[PDB]
Amino acid sequence: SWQLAVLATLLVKDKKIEQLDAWLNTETIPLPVIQYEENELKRWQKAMEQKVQEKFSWFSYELLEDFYGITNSDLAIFGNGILPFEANAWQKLLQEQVKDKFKLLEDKVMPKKVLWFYAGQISTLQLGIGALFGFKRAVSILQTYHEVFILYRQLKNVSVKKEDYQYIQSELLINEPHKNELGFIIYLGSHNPIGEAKAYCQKQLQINNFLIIQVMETSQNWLPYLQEINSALNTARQEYHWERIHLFQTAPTALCMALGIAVGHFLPVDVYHYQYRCVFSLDKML
Amino acid sequence: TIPLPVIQYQGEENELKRWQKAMEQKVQEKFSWFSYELLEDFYGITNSDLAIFGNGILPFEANAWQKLLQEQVKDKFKLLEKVLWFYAGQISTLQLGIGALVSILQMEFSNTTYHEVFIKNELGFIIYLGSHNPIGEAKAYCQKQLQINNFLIIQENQGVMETSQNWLPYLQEINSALNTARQEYHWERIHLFQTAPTALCMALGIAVDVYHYQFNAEEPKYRCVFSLDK
Amino acid sequence: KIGLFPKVFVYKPIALAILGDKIENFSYLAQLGKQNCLIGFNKNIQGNSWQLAVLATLLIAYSGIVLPSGEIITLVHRIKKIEQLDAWLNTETIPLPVIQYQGEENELKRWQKAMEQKVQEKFSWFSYELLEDFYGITNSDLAIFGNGILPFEANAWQKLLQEQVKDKFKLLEDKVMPKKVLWFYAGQISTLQLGIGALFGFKRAVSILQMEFSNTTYHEVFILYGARQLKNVSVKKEDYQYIQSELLINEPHKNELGFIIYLGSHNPIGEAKAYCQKQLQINNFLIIQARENQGVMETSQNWLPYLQEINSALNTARQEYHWERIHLFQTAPTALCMALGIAVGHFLPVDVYHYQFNAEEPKYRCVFSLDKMLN
RNA sequence: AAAA
RNA sequence: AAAA
């Protein structure tokens, strides 16, 4: 049984022999991570393993545990039951596992570079998870699994003017120019949240400054959507001052994740999950 | 042709020593036998003697500039004196007084070494050859304080002057323009303001009121720190 | 020649080393270093660990055992290869990878590892352990580090610049005294970089690096070594190819204007203009944005033109005007902020206002004044 | 304009 | 705008 170890030191340059050689010789070691029934967690993790094997046929979950110690639970943002609408539960969920999972897992694989492979379940929480991850992570965001966000600076392109918008249509509506706050309805999911969010802003927040961005071909790359979204945001933040932004958005988990990656914690941003509660605030992410 | 590298600095002594070592290397690639220990050995001129030095920031009071020029600078270039001077200084305006009282170098920072680039009757003499336009500030100071309306502006490749050749055409053109203005119109008092490399300022001095711009000073930012005819 | 090991003496292929037990001829030492030597000794030391000091003076204290292949196996003791040692003693410029960070030490270690890999891309002989062994700069000294988020107090920012930044480069350059420094710089907080560059100055050769997050590899976006083009203001407005500069003068009597730079993605123009018109009472402005690709500047290409045209616009705004005070509000790449602080320096009355994400309104605050940093 |  |  002492063969592979010697074989290992015969393949270091710094089931199958190719798997061991690429485990000891690659640099961009993948890590598939799911945000989440535990049986369904196992099924989704197996699907993620297959998807990351499509590009890295030498990578395996058991091999990952043997080589780096990262178990499937370490890659799992787990917790039983449906998510309560209370903000304390979401804040504690981010603080417990999601806050330092990336730091710990990158600390485990110290010499090699990292290519994350992220999948998720809940939409409005993907912004918090992406803000935790940040724009500085070489990450493939997947969606059978299909990788839809290839980020391995184009994700943060705001050059696209309102005239040459290929995918989305933006409509910034300002009724109180002296009030520095903005509603940020983003309509890219399934149901139309425009009326409910408008009523909520005009009733429970007294906001009449709202941003409306508005099912999607999963085969293509998903970067121009994020580019035009950020462009609309920063064209709105051009001749006016805003001190609070509130998301009321429906969209694929992948795109919300990438939007949390891009916009991040810089803007004063409180996402209100809809089943309408500030489960987290982006400026309070760090 | 004995080396004599004189450097003007105003700050901490450690940065002064770093600047001195760079200047020593600049002499060494032209005079390999020279060194600072050599300078303190054969001649005894120690590194502070070749340093026009003042701790901290030079205060923005005229008495300070006159004290700096008379106590050290006036006797610096005279008593320290065959010999050839390589000069590069910190304050651009102080080189005007230093020159008025030879290889004049300017530091190229990419490779971090110098290069020998030199081998009414009231008017505002104006020079803009650096990368910080003093035209508006000096013009406003003239109009609001000294009541000046006539100017001589000296100004190609602006902000980059090729520090791998001779800058003598620049100084020669400035001298020609100044002399032409003097022939055309008599100037009892010509007021000089400049944003320029320290090397060209020293050369211009080597070639009559001077004002200086201080970064950490309150308005007015310009004052007549000395007269070139004193 | 003298070499110290936990000492040896080297004289001018027989590298005969004398010893109390038995004199041996390590001919491969002479072969590795291309000089025959008669190694001296002063006391008997067990173990053949005196090889590395011998080989280093041949080519501070050293420890290790050489091999005929040139690989070194076991104060400098963390080296492995002969080329690393060769280019560690015989180079002209010592890379000094400086990273500014605010957070936890684990991400600091990761950031420094990435920056070390970038330096090794151009200087394969470099490494952090070898740097700390050869000259004593640890990872913390190169780190502008403070735990957690910086409090949004201008006193805290000025203090952080004072205790660490104001003397960091001076002390590090004093440490590597005989050799020049090729400063490899990256930072974290963009507004801090203006102060870091103003204290850095235009008198330092620097590779200012930005990371391509697609590969988690830094890129030499500001190459100012091998720097006068750093301060080129010969560019005219009609000759603008990278930046887009506007100058609004609504109050010519007031000698005050707001300098706003938008070369990142998150637009600061509205917030900064509101801050100037509502808290500083300023109507004059100098606004710089990108020309074509706003929010993305190609990290492969040289970023020097951006700063060139920015500085040219800044000094063209000063052509027919006197400005008692300039107010700087920027979103921009970390490297670009550092380069702009390097170029502009302390010569203008510029108060830089940082935008804090986790702060109540106003989120801008004059954390420092560019002319007041030397005080 | 305080090594332009 | 806290590795843009």
| Strand E close to C186 by CB, under 7 A | yes
Cα distance between the two ends of chain C: 46
Q: d(Cα A114, Cα A104) in Å, to the nearest integer? A: 12
Inter-chain Cβ pairs, chain B and chain C, closer than 8 A: 100
Contact (Cβ atoms closer than 8 angstroms) between residue C101 and residue C108? yes
Q: Do chains C and B touch (3 or more CB pairs under 8 A)?
A: yes
Closest alpha carbon to C1' of E3, residue: C188
Sequence-ordered list of residues with C-beta below 8 angstroms from that of B180, at least 6 positions apart, any chain: none
Cα angle, residue A69 at apex, residues A64 and A74 outer, rounded to 5°: 90
Please give the nucleotide, over all strands, whose C1' is closest to the CA of residue A137.
Answer: E3
Listed by the residue before each break, gaps in chain A with C–N over 2.5 Å are 14, 36, 143, 152, 214, 275
Closest alpha carbon to C1' of E1, residue: C331
Judge whether C339 is closer than 8 Å to chain B, CB to CB. Answer: no
Which of B60, B44, B45 lies closest to B10, judged by CA? B60
| Strand D close to B194 by CB, under 7 A | yes
Classify strands C2-3 and C180-186 as parallel, antiparallel or unpaired: unpaired
Contact (Cβ atoms closer than 8 angstroms) between residue A106 and residue A218? no
> Dihedral of CA C291/C293/C295/C301: which sign?
negative
| Strand D close to B8 by CB, under 7 A | no
Which of A43, A48, A123 lies closest to A83, judged by CA? A123
Which of C61, C59, C63, C73 lies closest to C29, judged by CA? C59
Domain boundaries, given as residue ranges, for chain A: 3-150, 155-284
Q: What is the resolution of this structure in A?
A: 2.8
Name the residue facing C295 among A138, A157, A237 (closest C-beta): A157
The CA distance from C131 to the nearest CA of chain A, in Å, is 18
DSSP-assigned letters across all residues of A133-186 = H-TTS-EEEE----EEEE---GGG-----STT-SS--EEEE-S-TT---EEEEE
Contact (Cβ atoms closer than 8 angstroms) between residue A246 and residue A207? yes
- Spanning CA of B108 to C1' of D2, the rounded length in angstroms is 17
Judge whether A231 is closer than 8 Å to chain C, CB to CB. Answer: yes
**CB burial string C154-184: b at 16+ within 10 A, e below:** eeebbebbeebbbebbeebbeebeeebbbbb
Whether residues B157 and C315 touch (CB distance < 8 A) is answered with no
| Strand E close to C139 by CB, under 7 A | no
Domain boundaries, given as residue ranges, for chain C: 2-84, 89-222, 237-372
Largest CA distance in chain B: 55
Q: d(Cα A87, Cα B146) in Å, to the nearest integer? A: 67
- Spanning CA of C365 to C1' of D3, the rounded length in angstroms is 33
Q: Do chains A and C touch (3 or more CB pairs under 8 A)?
A: yes
| Strand D close to B195 by CB, under 7 A | yes
- Spanning CA of B88 to C1' of D4, the rounded length in angstroms is 12
- Spanning CA of C58 to C1' of E4, the rounded length in angstroms is 47
Name the residue facing C205 among B14, B110, B160 (closest C-beta): B110
Please give the nucleotide, over all strands, whose C1' is closest to the CA of residue B19.
Answer: D3
| Test the A interface: residue of C294, C301, C354, C364 with most A CBs within 10 Å | C294
**Which CATH architecture does the domain made up of B120-227 adopt?**
3-Layer(aba) Sandwich (3.40)
Closest alpha carbon to C1' of D3, residue: B90
> Dihedral of CA C67/C72/C73/C75: which sign?
positive
Q: d(Cα A110, Cα C162) in Å, to the nearest integer? A: 33
- Spanning CA of B6 to C1' of D4, the rounded length in angstroms is 19
Residue A248 CA from chain centroid, whole number:
17
Contact (Cβ atoms closer than 8 angstroms) between residue C210 and residue C219? yes
Whether residues B110 and C202 touch (CB distance < 8 A) is answered with no
And the tokens for C165?
A: 């930044």
Which of B180, B222, B203, B198 lies closest to B52, judged by CA? B198
DSSP β-bridge partners for residue A281: A270
| Range 142-171, chain A: CB under 7 Å to any strand E atom | 153, 156
Report chain A's C-alpha Rg in angstroms: 21
| Range 351-370, chain C: CB under 7 Å to any strand E atom | 354-357
What percentage of chain B's residues is helix, strand, coil (to nearest 5)? Answer: 40, 25, 35
| Strand D close to C12 by CB, under 7 A | no
DSSP-assigned letters across all residues of A17-51 = HHHHHHHHH-SSEEEEEEE--HHHHHHHHHHHHHH
Q: d(Cα C239, Cα C276) in Å, to the nearest integer? A: 30
Which of B110, B84, B108, B221 lies closest to B165, judged by CA? B108
Q: Least CA distance to B21: which residue of chain C?
A: C178
Nucleotides of E under 7 A from a protein CB: 1-4
The CA distance from A51 to the nearest CA of chain C, in Å, is 20
| Strand E close to C220 by CB, under 7 A | no
Fold observed for domain C237-372: Rossmann fold (3.40.50)
| Test the A interface: residue of C266, C269, C331 with most A CBs within 10 Å | C266
Burial class (CB in 10 A: 0-12, 13-18, 19+), B17: middle
| Strand D close to C228 by CB, under 7 A | yes
Q: d(Cα A193, Cα A246) in Å, to the nearest integer? A: 13
Q: d(Cα C333, Cα C134) in Å, to the nearest integer? A: 32
Whether residues B107 and C203 touch (CB distance < 8 A) is answered with yes
Q: d(Cα A219, Cα C132) in Å, to the nearest integer? A: 49
Q: d(Cα C135, Cα A125) in Å, to the nearest integer? A: 48
**SS3 of residue B122 by DSSP:** strand
Look-up of token digits 């008025």: B100
Name the residue facing C106 among A103, A180, A237 (closest C-beta): A103
Cα distance between the two ends of chain A: 48
Sequence-ordered list of residues with C-beta below 8 angstroms from that of C355, at least 6 positions apart, any chain: A266, C191, C268, C271, C329, C331, C363, C364
Judge whether C222 is closer than 8 Å to chain A, CB to CB. Answer: no
Q: d(Cα A153, Cα C213) in Å, to the nearest integer? A: 7
Task: Give the HSE-up count for residue C247: Cα atoms under 13 Å, Cβ half-sphere.
Answer: 15
| Strand D close to B66 by CB, under 7 A | no
